[model samples]
Target: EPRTLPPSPNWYCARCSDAVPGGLFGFAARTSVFLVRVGPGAGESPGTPPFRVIGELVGHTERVSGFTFSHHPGQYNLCATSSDDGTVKIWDVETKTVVTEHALHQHTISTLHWSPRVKDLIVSGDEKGVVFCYWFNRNDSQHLFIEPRTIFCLTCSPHHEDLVAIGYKDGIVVIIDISKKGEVIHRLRGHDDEIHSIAWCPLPCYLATGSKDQTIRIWSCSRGRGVMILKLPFLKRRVKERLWLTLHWPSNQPTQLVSSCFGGELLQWDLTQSWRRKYTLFSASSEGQNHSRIVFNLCPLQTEDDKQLLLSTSMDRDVKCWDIATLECSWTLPSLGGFAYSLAFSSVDIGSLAIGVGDGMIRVWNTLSIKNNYDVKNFWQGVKSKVTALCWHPTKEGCLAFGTDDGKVGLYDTYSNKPPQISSTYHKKTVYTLAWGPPVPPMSLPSLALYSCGGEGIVLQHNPWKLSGEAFDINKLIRDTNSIKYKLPVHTEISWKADGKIMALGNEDGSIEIFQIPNLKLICTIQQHHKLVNTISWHHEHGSQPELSYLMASGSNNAVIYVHNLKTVIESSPESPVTITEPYRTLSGHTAKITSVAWSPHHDGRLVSASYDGTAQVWDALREEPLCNFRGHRGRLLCVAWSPLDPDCIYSGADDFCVHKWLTSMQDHSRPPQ
Candidate 1:
């Protein structure tokens, strides 16, 4: 199969993509690289010149950091991409194939820069400040290991093919001579903060560095000292207004510079004049015509007619073209699917997965495909309410149920062209959980019942065929049944046992309310912690041991996870409410609140937990310590899912808007031994 179909045009993260040579632009979402045909007048006509996907590259096993295209006419289609997998891949964009891949780094590759003077030579830097130069044509390489600081940005000097300028996290820049076995030529330190972008000017050996210190500094290569400093003109003099993202210099105009800022502002500078001689070319907040998010890249485009056009990509996945001379917007490519909030794998179709996005879109992808996905389906709800919870029917192949921010429930049938069925009944607050319970008695209702809980403290059981529901107020039960004074607690999370005879409600008061299904009677209330409860997951088989058949895992605002055994309470019950306060086992190590927990369907006594610390740990319930830790996300993790068909595969979604799929064995080797 040809691994050349892009997963989506919407980018998930920033600093992981770049514009191709002249007529093409590409963006990286996770591991796939998407190329769009974007010639000078792209998207200019009503229907003639549409900006669409031209090609894709999908070989990287991990998230891509950055890529660069070869400018030499002999190999114009050649492109090099760096990844967190600690490798660099050389691809032929025209064929959408990898020509060669190099795994010379021992850590995550942070930056990649193509030599402007030498097409076949590519320099890559990693998180450990390890730099390597690889010659694809000769199949040779050299490495340079700097201190412990990460390599934030790098550039291959246009004037010197063998000299590379690398910026580190400690506000230090190093110029290395790659031709001389990675010899250090100069180390300059001027910025008080980490340098995010570094570029060399056309002549006189001038280097430009942009930092988080809210300033851009120009250095003279000969003196190795800062000569000029530029600051963004903000309405208020704040300590940090706009952080610099990228810098570019037009080859034809050596004195002209273009930069993108973290605040979604595009700036133009006249290097020949003083630091105050700068222009705010485009403002995202002021104009509202440009991108509405942080601008990560600024690519200078010299069109066929010698017209200077600028290309910018934002965190919102919008690609825009600007006519620098005319100071007008040229064209744009709008991407769908805003920040991802929820993700779930299909039960019937093992390889199928659904991602609920903040734009009221539910995107489905077939993970079994060799090219990763071809957009199996994308459903858009007209309302602005973002999808917060997603669930698939246990027996139905194409039936999907989703909950929204506006307290609405929708059931989508993938086989039908008709709009999904929305429930007539709704909650007063955002729905936090949606689940498909076991089948009801014959003639009672059609198919399985869909249960949902929200911030209103109401759990509703809906008939999927009719969209009508019966609401059970847990708050009313707490007020009427409690003997002591109590406050109504919000239902934070809910989970049902595998057999569907019992349901567990996680509350804001750090209490677990047990209720019997069908009857809707309160069984017991367990108060074991003083913090809020965030997640509760029941094991597929309850428990392997006879005494622990009612095993359940619950996470709270505390860093610890507790596995509770409920076999004794239910088995010895005489239809009377009871209270239990102790957990069977406690799993520790996380320093932040546990956001989600998932038990392995294929294995016994094993589960995974995602935390606010941006790490996921696999644990054996029989042991108090974690089995292994998977630390990858830059932001806090939101949810994690275990593959039903594959025992080792796991998928995790986070605030970073990327769904990462990895194995549990911790064997993430993408390349062979050196």
Candidate 2:
């Protein structure tokens, strides 16, 4: 029998372009990375198959967290990755070889940075208070170490090789001297909560930090003190409006700092004036309230005429480039995904910019000139999802690394001079997190590994593969489309098994279906829950109990908790059939639909549940009632997550658009006045 092509991959070539037949964009590209053009027909909605994938990198073991290019001397094109596996790996951008790997203190490496002055210097930090500095010449070695109580960020000084600043979990700043071999040179303290980021002045001797404590601090290296602290004015007497901010210091002038704060405030600080808040660069007025969204990342540029420019990505799915001198946004790039995470300028070209969007795609904009209030881009395309992180290739201008939330890492060869060709799809989802790995290993290929985590509840590992001098055709991979690896059964919410080798799907009728991963193979079907399984979580520490290798945590409409432990059954007698020793524990406390349930990454015996009853409850697995009830959210909590870094940190997202960070360890009896 002659073989027929799969419907998903089949395409019709019209003239110089291959058009997607049946308008489904040929494939879902759901969490998969693709290279697409965005000039005229790019706005075609979902199922419209005009976008193309020139290449794909499919080597990640889980969702990707962070990806960036190396700044090492003679190895500028190297890429680095930090993953959920608590490890960092470096790769050669052109050859895609694993350069070096190191364990990042057994916690998830949330971010990574390549030192601007030192070629082999790398820095990474995690949720816990672990900040690490590694020197990658031919192998990995700890160059400097400091234990900030709650370290969240580690940023290297661009102008000074020995100076590095760290943002702590308790909102403090610690400057270390890597040149002197692991010494805390200075400590600056102020903020009341977790510090998210610290960025060095592109020039010299200045740095900025942003925090959950609702303030941005600018520190001076020479003075060894905080030069300035910026905070928002109280808009209402009842509300303590705290915004999560990210700082961007343009390379041209380190004295001017740009920041995106919560509630859509984009402010520019003039560091020359003691880092005072000089100008509110942009703010969402009543007219553009919806459009002036939360800015997530910012990149500043200078035009040929030396005009200061700013490029910003936001939660609104749009990229805007502002003329700093005019204090007006000159051009707005089209929106692609849910949000924009990272933005970078092309080191090869002056006028071009690369944007990492929430949909896991990287868009290149050629801002030769903002004609008619819009960026004049050759085209735009999707690269990765929940694109939380991005870094430009040091040697190659259009080449870039994109990190997505779904644990997929993508490398795109976006040669703007010619039609760009994507060559790598090493990740599967929005590689939202990123870290720069080591440059070399004594016995391994120079490679970069990235960390990722997303909806599936499993961390991913991604390695890079460069497509230089190789006859690798990404279009062929794009054309060779097949059905997505796993399709959820109808009316079911799908989740990954503990090992991520299989999928566990819960149906509305309470029947659970299990299928193999990558290759969808039906494993076992069980009719367990009486109602819809609202949530499912795999056990963290499964010991020697092979029979109970996986623990299923499911919430149902019955307002009860069901804990099912699976075991094999066998019969002894001829007529008497043997029944499996599988046991289930059910507990009831909530009086309404159990909206969400999550397992604590820190404790195997701890679980948390959220319900429509407007309360979040923590329960010990073996207990009948909740150990404590968190009653802050007035509405239904849709999702809850336990921080892998901090055992006491719990996060909840609700319909109210308010994400609450609760301190589970706070046991004070006096409840704050709501």
Candidate 3:
């Protein structure tokens, strides 16, 4: 049952999630469509619209710059956003996951324009004036790259699909022909200041330009000089009040153009009447504390209610709806997270608008809603840190422990509605791996036996009920003891048997050290490979009596593995007994170093290994042949785990940094699906 309710319910709209003709479920042709995860799959929601965070889509750390939504006649469309975070991200708007991300080669992206005529093609411009036209299609290798000129504004040609209009900081405008391999087809020079906005007339031969020089002009597409130039003449006495930031010609009003200034001024002009000023509009404030600068030059659009509303943002990060007919501010929307640098509104009357801000967030506002003010969402994850380790808990459903390369650990509870939490600097250096001990009887408070190891040589154990790695206990660590003298165990591994009776440390000193539990007394050690020990897992009892002893397996950096007989230790006449020194059987196949090893929970001599060679193989030592192979990872395998209850389930993570879970059966691979 729900407990507390905030003053209001709110959600985050993805970056640049605007209302389009297709709503949310229409542009699916460019990529595979995965439905929004909520309820039983992603995070639980009260209804079917899915949770606000389908997943934390992290890539950009700095403020994001360019963003665009794609068009697909069938499925929900795609969105590509460029960021000062030095990237252009393509997200399947429905899935809330990144489909593909391009690093503008470390150059900051200034703007992006999605092609409405082309399904997957998008043109992006970087801060250094680099332009590239590419598709989100991963299968296609074709792209158009142009080494170019703030490129302050970009507009796609509606009449000519493959042409684009680009405005630069140098008061230069060029119409680029994408179909001609990104060549400049036309260049227009008229304004003497930095270009701030660019728009085209539906009449097919006119282009509009607004600039910092306090003037708005129109040029002929077929020729050079300006057909109509607009500027107030104060007898050449520099007027600072006329900083024109945006210009537009409403499609419905074909013969007229509207220009907007920073100081709360909206001037309408008539192109049909010798480009004369038709009328003027003002903000609710009297243009003086009354004055506001249209800091972001990105303009708004006309709605369907026989009225046009221009969406503009000011220095205070407040978004406003300008009602043209009334010549006043219609209504101010919600405050964006930071300085609003970009604005867009859908033409349809479905009540939606998108705004970008300095805080690397985007908000979509619902124009008309009585129950709620905004349908906004800020679905961003924490800062990007490489995923270093993953471990599935034994008795819990969808409960897993994941570690970041930044020495942070997090317990993500997928099955519960409670918010998940990430950890802080548990270790000073990157966290390499972590292992969980057996869960105590459920009635207990909790166990503090989760061990962590990485760059720091000491092994750390902690209780994870608390959320953070920082605020938790940090000083108590188990390290080399006087009796054991454990040192140089660089590629550290920890294994607690299903029964929780013993622990095995796979160390870099090329040995598997067996220890007694609780006291951490070193009982025995197994040494075979000269390479560093990479992974370890204990075998379970099967096809034997209740008194039967089990086995243990360890993998090494050289891709070699060995299964040892734990039964070698027996009661002797001496006061203390010695352990076996040699392994019983060897299992080998991977061409590269082994990355992870896991033993089947229900089998006697069955185990699997994931390696740097991008492969995972299941081995049945009882039958002396290879079982089915799970080639799931795309790069050097980092870690793999078998389910404690399910014999056919496995989890894997790799250098490519992806964790995957799927079911497989050695018997089923030879037959059909059951």
Candidate 4:
């Protein structure tokens, strides 16, 4: 009897996460999307080649905008996409079926979101400041729909099952009470410019908001008051540079807040000090010095001793990791080209890290040994799109997902201890952002979904275990002209439920369309968002009305957030609920382009966001107040990440060149008078 090779070992390389599944090994994965060689490396070995086009997703008529994940987990999972073509699409990972489709706003769909609390509810917004709420019910025939004013960001309250929040272009925050009939219950006002981002506190009754006005505000819904406001001290005067974007809460300190600015400075705020300034972490050496290198994203890792570590990417093409307590740079990762857009930790463990490079490549690294000896090891490379956003699987530790500038979504499996296995070529244009859906129960094969946003809007659905056939060969397939023409049609990104049920997708014209994943049957259509739709997240589990599920939220470039109700679809539908009305309410407050939005991982009714405006804000879905505003970044903010272990803590990145740590409480520094 012969011994069989165990599933590949999951491991990370040194500094670069892309090095895993080393090129020396001859293992490969297949994808249905078109793979473009945006960089120089086209056919060389994995690490040896400067770059290569692993795969590609071709179907959209125009440019692709953003991508996101589903509420399940596994390899080559599901994804949702947004595009300039005015459509939102859902794709299945295994079959590559365009299971669902929806029409968006008259313009492009700027952003999209799937409810984190309910998998069936979805919200979308557009450049014109219009938002639509869509409800998808597997059992019902009719769909639910709603339309809200134009806004930028949208998020569902992690704590309240019936509450939703929205962020608008004009910097207004609105809250909707969905517990009964979906209705806008209250509106919070702040920020002079378009509201780019907002976040609800992980703790109940708190929210955060950020805007182009260069300020961060915190509100408490329980007390109905503006708890705290943060502003860059240097910007008070005629400073040459100012803060452009910011994020709050880090894994190490949940109560503290951190932000970055155009001046290439990283500032830390002590939330316990009444939102007072704690210290300036990084800044230019002198006044008038041009800090051109902007930081794009930030990621936090947990050390062996349970301490917090920070990682950030900059337009200068550098990735740096720092120790919060020591406030010093501990490790630095070299950039391939352009600016680093986003960073993600391995879902398998904290030792592995992933970074999205401006050159349209993703690098993977194993930081396990770094803590002990600072030695860099395995590095895995994959994808051809300028990787804009990245997120680890919510449950799978060794699996990772990313979005590219060319509208591609790629999945990589680092579980192979020997090297790394990659599934590239998922989208078409510059995939701006991606998120992992809520974790599903083991009864269902771990399902995962991804959202891709760019020139168009789309969503890709995935099922890892369903993969079939042998690994793909790029050289052999590309050489055969006839084979290329006759090749099997690439599968669509939209997919249906495990039982061949319902499906969803985002369109280029800023709308979300729904249909049956297996048969491609039309379900319903949702028109929302003004510009390009970026992201969509679904709720895995809901406490109330467990039998009837609902969707969470949607985000757009118009800087608006929309929330929808799905239960109504089941009650009033003739077939199944696939479409919905406008959003229940809008949570607004940001004065710039919205980059990314996310719900609280630890608690319900709390939301968080990052933006080009240089600030991160938290919001409460139930109450009509902002929780906390975090200001720090000096450059355009690109992405934000929240720690699964700690709910109230989060991280953000920007063009400025530094990553700051944040917490909700202040440190006890009395120390007996030293």
Task: Tell me the whole-model lDDT of each prediction, alpha carbons only.
Answer: 0.72, 0.51, 0.54, 0.48
For candidate 2, the C-alpha RMSD (Å) to the true structure equals 25.8
**CA lDDT, candidate 1, residue 502:** 85
lDDT of 3 by residue, 418-458 (tens): 44466554777655666777322221225534666665644
lDDT value, candidate 3, whole model:
0.54
Ranked by lDDT, the better of candidates 2 and 4 is 2
Error of 1 at 415 (Å): 2.1
Residue range 403-511, candidate 4, lDDT tens digits = 6666555566656643223334344545555544422212122455443334433334333443221222222322242133443222212222223244444444456
Q: What residue runs in model 3 are displaced by over 4 Å at the alpha carbon? A: 1-164, 167-172, 176-384, 392-402, 408-428, 438-446, 463-491, 540-549, 568-581, 601-604, 630-633, 642-651, 657-674
Stretches of candidate 1 above 4 Å error?
1-337, 370-376, 438-447, 468-488, 542-549, 667-674
Off by over 4 Å in 2: 1-58, 71-76, 92-100, 143-145, 233-242, 272-276, 283-293, 300-311, 319-674
TM-score of every candidate: 0.54, 0.42, 0.49, 0.40
What alpha-carbon RMSD in Å does predicted model 1 have with respect to the real structure? 13.9
Candidate 1 per-residue C-alpha lDDT over 1-674 given as tens digits, one digit per residue, 9 for 90 to 100: 11122233323222455665456676775666767666543433453333445556778878778788787777768888887777799998878999999899898888788888986998888888888888999998887886678888888898988788888877888888887877778878777877778888877488888777767888887887788888756622112334545677767678877776545667777877874665556533345555545677666666555666677776545567787776566665444444556778887987788877667777776777543223345677544578888888878988889999899988888767668888888888988788877533221435577878887767676788777545445455445544436565677888888778887888888998887755446778888856888788887763455454488899988988999888878877647788878878888788888888988887777878888887778888867656767765545777888877778878777775555666877634221111
Q: Choose the strongest candidate by lDDT.
A: 1
Higher-scoring candidate on TM-score, 3 or 4? 3
In model 2, the worst 10-residue window by lDDT is 10-19
Choose 1 or 3, whichever is better by TM-score.
Answer: 1
- Indicate the residue-level lDDT of 207 in model 1: 85
Query: What is the clash count for each candidate, in the order shown?
Result: 0, 69, 13, 269
Candidate 1 backbone clash number: 0
RMSD, each candidate, Å? 13.9, 25.8, 14.5, 27.1
